[PDB]
Amino acid sequence: KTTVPFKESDDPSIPLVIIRRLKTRDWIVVLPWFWLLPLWHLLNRIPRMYHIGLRQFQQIQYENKQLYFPDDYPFTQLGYIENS
Amino acid sequence: VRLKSRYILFEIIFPPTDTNVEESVSKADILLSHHRASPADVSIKSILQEIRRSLSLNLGDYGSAKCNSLLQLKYFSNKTSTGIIRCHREDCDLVIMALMLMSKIGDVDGLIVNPVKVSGTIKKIEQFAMRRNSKILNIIKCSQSS
RNA sequence: AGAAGCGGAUUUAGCUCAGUUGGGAGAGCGCCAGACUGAAGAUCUGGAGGUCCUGUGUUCGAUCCACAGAAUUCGCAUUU
RNA sequence: GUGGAACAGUGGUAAUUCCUACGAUUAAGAAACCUGUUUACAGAAGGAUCCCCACCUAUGGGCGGGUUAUCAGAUAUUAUCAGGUGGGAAAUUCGGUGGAACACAGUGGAGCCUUGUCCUCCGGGUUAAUGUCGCUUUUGGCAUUGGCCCCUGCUCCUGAGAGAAGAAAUAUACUGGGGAACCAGUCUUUACCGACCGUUGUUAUCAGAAAUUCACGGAGUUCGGCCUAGGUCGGACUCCGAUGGGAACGGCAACGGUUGUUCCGUUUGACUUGUCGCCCGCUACGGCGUGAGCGUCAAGGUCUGUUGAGUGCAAUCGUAGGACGUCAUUAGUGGCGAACCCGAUACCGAUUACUGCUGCUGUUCCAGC
Ligand SMILES: [Mg+2]
Ligand SMILES: [Mg+2]
C-alpha cells in the first residue's frame, strides 16, 4: 500500500472548495495561500495534465466566444488606457 | 546542412491496343487491363540505360549534363512497375518532360509512362503510394464483391 | 550526396606517429649520399627535410598552461 | 574649438518587402507539406393545421379507424473549403531548466570518524570590573574578562547578464596593454576602520653570499655577563651589499575549513499485448464465459502523443499583377529587396559570419578669423 493514514488528533484537515464558473466554462478551486502548493504539485503528476499561460488563457477565452479584460475590453477606463 | 533533392514516382502503363478483340467497360476491369504486368527483361539498369538514351536523343547533351548530375533510380520493382527517380528541384521539369517522351523500350514496345507523384522527400511519396494502392485495392474489391 | 541534435577522442617533418618539471624540437618509413655487391635487395652510417592547426594572454622562456576561433574523427544495438 | 569627407573599434536593433489570385480526384489527404471545419439536437418526443366515415350533444366541440397534403430563422444549397510554411542567427555547444515542494543540502538507507561543538571571523571602537607604574578631587599607559556595534549592488530556480569605483590622487583600487570609449586578471561595493587564506612543489645552467622570509659580511640601537676612559662576547630589531626578469612571504600549478565525507535508487510517461486479484451466472479442489471496469508487474510492440513549420534518404514551392524603397536613363523605363545562413523538443545567456540605421571615441585631409 502507498498511503499515509488520517488521524483526527494530529493531521491538518484543510477546508477545500471547488466551484463551477459559468461563462468561462471552467472549474475553479480555492484554498489558502500556503496550502495551494501541496495541492498544486500533485496535480500535473497525473500524466494528462498541463499548465496554462496568460496568452493561453486568452486563447481559451477567445475559443469559447468569451471576453478578456486587458485586451477584449476597450470600453472601460483601465482597459482603454492600458490597451491603447 | 543537407541537400534538397526531389523524388519522382512513375508507373509503366500498357495501353491495350487490340483492334480485333472486344473490350469490357468498367472501372476496375480497365484498371486490370492497364495494370497487367511488366515484361521479363525489365530491371533498374535497363530503365536507366533507356532513359539516358531518351535524354540524349530528346534533350541533347548539355541538358543531359544538367539532368545526369543526380539522375539515379533509387527504388524499383518489376512486380508492380512503380519506380522512384531522384533529381534536382531545378531540373525536375526536365526529368518529368523526359519521362513524358518515353516511347518504347528496346525489347518491348507499346507502353506509356505515368509520372504520378513528385515531392522533395521519399518517405511521404511511399506513404502516398501505399494510400494510392489502397484505393486501387478498394476499387478492385468493390468490383469483385459486386 | 544518406542531415539534425549528444557525449568521447584528437591535430607535431612528405607520410604514420611518439614525446613534454615548461628550457634539445624527435623516431620508423620515404628521398639523397656513403658503405657494400660483378649488379641488386636486405643490413648499416650520415645528411637534407618543421606554419608543433591558428590567434590572444600568462611567464624570464611555450608543442606543454589559460582563453578564443577553426576543425579532425568515432559511437548512436552499423558494414550503407 | 567648429563643419564636411574617408576609415577603424564597441553598444543597441531588423531581416522570406507586403498584399491578391491560381496550381488534377465519388479513386473525396497528388500545387512540396501540415492542421482544422468532432463537446451530436430544426423547444418536429406521444409536433401543429387539414381529408373521409361512424358516434354523443347542440350556441361552441370531443373521441375511434384509414390513407396522407403543407410547415421547421436569408421560400435555397446535403458532396465544399480555410489558414500557415525558415532565423537572428536555426551555424557555434560553452552552459542550465522542464527531477526537487523558497535551504525542507529534494528525499530515504547503509558504513566510517574528529561521533555533526545552538562554536570563533581574525581584527577595530565604546562601556564596566581587576592588578601594576607615574601625577595626587583625579587623570594617563599596559594586560585580562564580560556585553554591544561592523556593509546579500540589481533581475533570476539554475546557467548567466550588465551598473558604479567622489569613505587617499591628476590615469578614478592594483597590474599589463589599447588610438580612446576601454579590454583582460586579481578585487571591493551605504565597508561613515582595513584585511589578496593556508600547505606542497617549481623559477633549468651560470652569476652572486644566497632561488625562497636556512645561513653568511658591514653599520646603528637596546639589554645582560667580565669590566669601567664605554674594550670584548651573546641575543633581538632595522638598513645595505656589483649577479640575473629577480631577493619582492613576488609569479605559476594542485588541494580544502565553509552547515562532516563517500556510496546507492527514482521523483518520468501514454496507448497495445500477457499474467494475477476483485463483483455476475454455471460448476463446486485450484475452474470456465462477458463487462470495449479497476490496481500492480513485464516486454529494443508503437510514439506524426507533433509544436499558431514539425521533417525524419531530412517538405518549407513555381508564376502573374498591384503598393513601397534604392541606383542608372537617349522619354521613361530598366535592374535590384540582399549578405550569413539554414530547424529536428522547447527555453534563455554568451560567441562567431554579413548588410543597413543610430550614439560615442580616435586618426587623416580641407577652411572662419
Ligand atoms: Mg542545426
Ligand atoms: Mg546545433
Distance, Å, B10 CA → D134 C1'? 121
Nearest-10 crossing angle of helices B123-145, B27-34: 130
Q: Which of residues 84-113 of B touch strand D (CB under 7 A)?
A: 89
* Neighbouring C-beta atoms of residue B2, cutoff 10 Å: 4
Q: Which of residues 70-99 of B touch strand C (CB under 7 A)?
A: 70, 72
Distance, Å, B78 CA → D2 C1'? 87
Which of chain D's bases lie under 7 Å from a protein CB? Answer: 24, 27-34, 100-102, 267-270, 304, 308, 311-317, 342-343
Contact B43, B139 (CB under 8 A): no
Q: Alpha-carbon distance A68 to A60, whole Å? A: 10
Phi, psi (rounded to 5 degrees) for B97: -75, -25
Would you say the C-beta of B103 is within 7 Å of strand C?
no
Collapsed DSSP state (helix, strand, coil) of residue B73:
strand
Resolution in Å equals 3.5
Contact B74, B84 (CB under 8 A): yes
Q: Alpha-carbon distance B35 to B45, whole Å? A: 22
Measured in Å, residue B120 CA sits from the centre of ligand 1 at 19
- Closest Cα to residue B120, out of B11, B4, B9? B4
Would you say the C-beta of B119 is within 7 Å of strand D?
yes
* Neighbouring C-beta atoms of residue B61, cutoff 10 Å: 10
Experiment type: cryo-EM
